[PDB]
């Protein structure tokens, strides 16, 4: 009652073959390889993990750790003042500031190592393999639908997390690290659980059914028999005895088909003109035309020759430029420019990362909220630069600076 | 009695098929992918929510929170002066200013977290699904009409608000934030109800009737039988025989049709010239012309040959430029360029955001209020920078600065 098959039809297979370059290729299509890059998602995961780790810090625990470090070094301010026996406030303040700076550097590098360990643990799951981001992107590019199958199970990411966390020696060395780990454990476990729950269906196996009257989707895997959900980003259109998607490939399809047909005709015409001389016959390296079978009681009037050969450079150039412009504007890809002449730099714009990465996490993966998203510049930015940027901009720095200021004031005033 | 159907006619279906690119495609048409972007509406929602949250802050609650924080830290100004025992008012003023600054940073991060939570709650349902902004835009671009259907119901947005607001622990932490939230709750509920009540009809199901004698519109859904309202932004014209709309696609239609027909004729002529030699016959790889099928008391006088092949590159280029100029001048889209490079970025102008987003919220969504609209520059800005700007220019900055100045004066005069 109103159901119809959508995906296993030859049209989408032809779309995917076009995406693989099975018919024709152009320089401008190469931009698509940057669209599938998994840099933005990994950067977002790094930012989320950094925020989650640094949001568990406690001021009192940090103060206790600093006091313990000072006691271990035996560098209490009064002892140093009574050893130096001078009223040089600037010198003793500089000494205390240097000690605090060394402690800050050691804490920063320990936190960086722990955070990088967490990021490395989370890395293999998302960008490739199960629930891979390029699979989502080419799902969007071909159809506009992203079928998903869900089942509540454990996975390897959680196993790696539980193996790594329990044996980590950094917890036994710093109370702050252990407290942050134990407070953020449930969140990380839930995040990995969400990672391992979802699975984007492969292109060659899944089935999609659409009903026009009710306007609902059905997606199932014919092998396992499992039913899932069908996510739609831009909806298709029903024109009666047809279905027309609004994916970029759908828009670019007629031009590609026309250019391919032109190239085939050009090749066929080229192979015809191999011979140099051609001779015609009639009723009273070389190719002969015999018209005896058709000249029966017939008289020849005239004979014309015109060796036409089509040209297809302009069509290929236009198709390449069209592909580049369509992929740049549709996915909102930002290109950096040199001073003059050529330009070579491709990255994701802020609008692109928002409108594509955020729906991925929110709906496709159903992960919990990850906080404020990164900007478009942070994708270009490196790992350590992002780490110490978020370290500076977080509230962990304020407690450390306040402690340093109070300690320096107490040292210099006494 | 004067009613005539409008929308299910083949003309509008052909207009939509033109938008999907059935009748060819050009690089100029790709600018349409920026007109349908949902950045402006999300920016407006963020600004409205930020204003609603910031306007509800209370001076007395903030003063009480400041006193409580001072008591918790034990930072009584007189006690600190009696402890330090020095006449350096600059040092104590700097200490108080630093404490106020750290509290400012913590309050800012908590407010940002709560505001981002609300924005994430409102985001999924606004620009897509019900009241889909791209659907509104392509309704405007095809016809000039935006049919709507309304019903008073709750929805997922209200449920998400109910779950998030009452289960967020931030309310139990700061009295000021909870007080502002409980003041702003009714407005957020009304906004969510406005989101959930309005639905924009799909292009493939709804029906539209017009009657020129009275000048009235009728819109109905043939499936559910529900009757809605028909909104008009630029009115159409009635010429007796037909109804002529004034949407951009209507103006650009004849040029598109002419170019498509020219391309078809060029292809047909191209397929004819695949034969190198052509032969003619008459009464006393190869193509034979037997004109003796008609020869009866006849005599051949002369023969001619002229293999014409039309060219269509200039037409395609002109059509692309016309498409780009029409879209830019109609939707008022601002284009940015480098020193010599073209299309550094594409963004909505202030006139565009006003004249398109504001009528959307005011009529289609029937939102109660959106506050002062943002400029075109705020679209480029990210969420965090926009939040910083609105926080700087809001009412709350008055109370915070006044309290900080008064406390600094009291500390330095203690």
Residue numbers in the entry:
A (entry chain a), B (entry chain c): 24 to 27, 29 to 308, 494 to 623
Question: What are the paper's exact sentences on this?
Answer:
Three capsid types have been recognized from the nuclei of herpesvirus-infected cells: empty A-capsids, scaffolding-containing B-capsids, and DNA-filled C-capsids. A unique portal vertex exists at a 12th I5 vertex through which the genome is translocated during assembly. Here, portal proteins assemble into a dodecameric basket-like structure that is thought to seed the assembly of scaffolding proteins, in turn driving the formation of spherical procapsids composed of MCP, SCP, and triplexes. A separate protein complex, the terminase, associates with the dodecameric portal and initiates genome packaging and the concurrent autoproteolytic cleavage of the scaffold.
